[PDB]
Amino acid sequence: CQDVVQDVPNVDVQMLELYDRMSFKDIDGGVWKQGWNIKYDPLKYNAHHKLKVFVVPHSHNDPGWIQTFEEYYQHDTKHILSNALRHLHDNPEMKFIWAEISYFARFYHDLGENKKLQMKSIVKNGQLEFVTGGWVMPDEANSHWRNVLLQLTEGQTWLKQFMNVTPTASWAIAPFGHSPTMPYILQKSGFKNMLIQRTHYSVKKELAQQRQLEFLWRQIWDNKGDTALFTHMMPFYSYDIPHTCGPDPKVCCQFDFKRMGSFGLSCPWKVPPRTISDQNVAARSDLLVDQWKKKAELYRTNVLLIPLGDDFRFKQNTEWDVQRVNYERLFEHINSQAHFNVQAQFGTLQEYFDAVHQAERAGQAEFPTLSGDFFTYADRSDNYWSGYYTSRPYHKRMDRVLMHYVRAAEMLSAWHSWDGMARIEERLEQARRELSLFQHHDGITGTAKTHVVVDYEQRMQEALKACQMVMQQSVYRLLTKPSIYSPDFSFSYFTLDDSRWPGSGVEDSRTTIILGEDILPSKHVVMHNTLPHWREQLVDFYVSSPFVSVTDLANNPVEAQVSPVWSWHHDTLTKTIHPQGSTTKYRIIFKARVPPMGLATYVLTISDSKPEHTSYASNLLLRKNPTSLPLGQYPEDVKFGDPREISLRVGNGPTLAFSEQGLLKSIQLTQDSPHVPVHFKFLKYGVRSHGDRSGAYLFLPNGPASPVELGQPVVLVTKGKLESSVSVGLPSVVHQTIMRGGAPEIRNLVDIGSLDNTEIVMRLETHIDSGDIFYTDLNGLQFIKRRRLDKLPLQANYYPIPSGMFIEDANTRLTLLTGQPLGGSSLASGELEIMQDRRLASDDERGLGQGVLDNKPVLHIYRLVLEKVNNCVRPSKLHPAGYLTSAAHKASQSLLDPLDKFIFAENEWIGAQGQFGGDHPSAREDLDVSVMRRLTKSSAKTQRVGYVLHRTNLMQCGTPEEHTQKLDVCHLLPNVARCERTTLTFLQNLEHLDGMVAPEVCPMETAAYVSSHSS
Ligand SMILES: CO[C@@H]1O[C@H](CO[C@H]2O[C@H](CS[C@H]3O[C@H](CO)[C@@H](O)[C@H](O)[C@@H]3O)[C@@H](O)[C@H](O)[C@@H]2O)[C@@H](O)[C@H](O[C@H]2O[C@H](CO)[C@@H](O)[C@H](O)[C@@H]2O[C@@H]2O[C@H](CO)[C@@H](O)[C@H](O)[C@H]2NC(C)=O)[C@@H]1O
């Protein structure tokens, strides 16, 4: 295994180092506004060394943005694909590339068989080439790597099945900044090449000046380079035709033949395209070849890529003709005039990369190595695209909920083959596709129109229902005695109970377990643990009595705590935000212990008075002018007091101190240790009253944030043996700190209400001497070192926080883990901050044509981990990565993949069993079974199950390692007949494994395996 900690890779370009040295001055470069006037030597190309130009026609099709997926499909994309089929069929030299398989599958499945065959033929002969082949072209900032892989797999499995092709070149012209998680996943999925476009204009200029726009992109920890993937970065401001032929858009626009007027388009530089004729072709060719040769000066080979496309292009038949005929005329003239020393043709992306590597192999070029990321993007001026790290945070959180529900549904249902009448494959395909669609760079990013966000939400809601159906049918099958099992595949044997989605104040979706002497004495509940290690976690349920006790299914009592059900209300008469308790519903909490990838059953039973193994939390309401708070049968009366500082400790865990406003002020890790200052604060950013306005994409604050004026908020303290909490009703945020004996959990119910032109930030202030350094993750996969740069504006120092961030000094680290991607930074030494929501009245001039005024309450969840790290073996000062500790990694897992909770829906479960998976291996804590998916339907004689196995890297801090069991996923199901290592999409076999044993993987590596079983 490569060491991912102690060896600093040697790369030609390391983006953090480049950032430290780069000036970022925004000077007028001339016609290339963010570059310089490119010069070339005409003598560079000659008879023995021609410039080979590939013009690659393309059409950017957004799967929702300004219109919904279906609206775009009906108005634009079905016509683009129908006319592409016709025109490519009829014009054998014409070419076209296609990226978004969600639309292509949507089209192809509606084609008559003779058109399906025609389509297959133009793909087979190379005229229509798929690039990337994901369901979408995903966002790279907010997306979790697991969902990037899910959508890539959904698109590529469709293409292999129906088109018999698997792209090895990726095309990502539109995400708003780029992540090295993409080459990581793509290189492990068979790819050889990738292309990106939206990188900071200063980076484009710097890399262009060094001809470092094509590079071998390796991961930041990878010393040896086996992760490297050849990457092409486009050099100019846009992927449209004015910015793809060469550096001068006033010239290149004249070669977009859709702009002469009848199509409703024109050239902003005020020189239109002119139809090519014999009379003008020499002059037009001279202008175009000059642009090409300038672009070619920025790259190292004599093979030049010229994309030819824009959004929803190649729609009308007359557009196909006008682009094709004019370019054919240009090519005939240029190719026949030796003085240009150019051979130009339509091509595909794969054609371009193959010719580049042929030139490399011939010794014409060597390419630099690069590591790092390309966040935060700015396309011009100070317009940094950090707003979309937070926009529409309800759906950002929903993404992570559904992420987990899809994993759990696929894993729970994978253990068996299912009859087609159960509709398991149908429901899972729906769930995978709606989650995959939302990875689109206008979906999770929060950059679509309001009605499109509603369409994504509705799709994801249907996907959650599909996951629930599959999970509950699977639990019923896995825990009922086989000779009793008698399923109705349409029935709900269980309902899911989810305490954090949509979340209190977001929606009371939670069912109460109704118990009573004259109706039902007891109820079975079942917990699922998708992680491959034994796990304990407190779980809570709502019950209709406080007098409830818990047993396991050996009838062993389980210690439990009952608390009230508190809900917060904005009281429009007293003008306060305060909690109300239920007098008929209560929360019971207990520790569930669940096998690896397994299930555990418990029983809740009512009794007529306090049970022996159930305790009751106390409750203290801190406010001036209190009023009573009755709680029905709850055995402890609520206490009242004026606001005051308070401190709490659960178990042997940290002691937390709170201000009289209900906000954390310090953490004491042990009885001996110091109370370490850790202060939570809420602040607000506004919008500029002159100049460019923040919108769904851009964050353009009017200066540093200002504190939220808190008034005298009401604070509720609940103190229990198992769980305590401090909750406070602040303006726009019900803020909750929950303690269960280790790192606290923070929940914010964020309702920015009608606060126009406001962004709500949660900041942590500490004494940690972090300086200008902080760490944030990329796609939930890796943590990258960031350096705050005062030479950049505040919004440029914001980065995606897809799952966590930390600061540290020699002795102390503070890590904040998230259950949702949001934007954040460290704007001063010892701070962390993360945006909660943003409400913006204005459009920000990037095409959305609306502000962000559709906010809804969202429950954001976090874990806060303060740790001593002076004993940890950390990377050297020059290393670009950081790594979590075991506690912070487990805390992230507790947010993203909690236990699932099932409530049996009818009165008696006959045949119930107490556990599933007790004989599953409990793997080392840094290993995960990220995916388990049965790949065959029931009629296959040889069943196949795929697994994606990911090992993270945790810091060594001197905790002796607990001997654990080796996990061999190929023996998790019986009767294994073969074990293969595959690409991560499962589509190619890479190794036939000895002994049918799937090896575990190295730290920071991810591997896929498929087990085959005789059935
Ligand atoms: C119509 O207003 C202009 O259009 C441009 C913005 O709309 C353009 O792009 C839209 C985006 S679709 C695409 O990306 C979005 C994210 O933006 C994503 O969510 C979707 O999924 C898609 O993938 C689209 O709706 C339209 O088709 C259109 O292309 C924008 O380029 C332009 O801004 C330039 O022009 C104004 C003047 O009109 C200037 O004031 C700006 O400064 C900017 O000028 C450009 O600056 C760069 C850097 O200096 C130069 O190199 C360019 O040459 C220069 N262009 C021009 C015309 O001067 C407007 O907003």
Ligand SMILES: [Zn+2]
């Ligand atoms: Zn797009």
